[PDB]
């Protein structure tokens, strides 16, 4: 009565959704990852800084 097929199916749902998100926003995340730090500095906040 393992009934793990439901658990494995949930894992598939999560993992296929992850793959779909990778396809959807893979390029955007790759372009964001090398210059993420900029988000911490907002132009006017640079003067207030």
């Amino acid at each position: 009565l393992i009934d793990r097929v439901e658990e494995v199916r949930e894992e598939m749902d999560e993992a296929q959704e992850a793959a779909r998100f990778l396809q959807q926003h893979g390029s955007a995340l790759t372009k964001l990852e090398p210059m993420v730090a900029v988000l911490q500095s907002d132009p006017q906040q640079h003067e207030q800084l």
Binding site: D3, V8, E11, M12, E14, A18, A19, L22, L29
Partner: protein, 50 residues
């Protein structure tokens, strides 16, 4: 900034677990075939019991 940090935190996990879909796919195919066999065995057991 915080949203981007969280997104870059999750994204490697997403990439890490995406490849497991296909290994998971055969896993559930085998598991469900096993469950079909288990259901058949249970049905046949009950069938003879009487």
């Amino acid at each position: 900034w915080q949203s981007a940090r969280e997104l870059l935190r999750d994204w490697p996990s997403q990439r890490h677990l995406a490849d497991r879909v296909q290994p998971l796919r055969m896993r559930l195919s085998e598991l469900e075939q096993r469950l079909n066999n288990q259901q058949n065995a249970e049905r046949l057991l009950s069938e003879f019991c009487k």
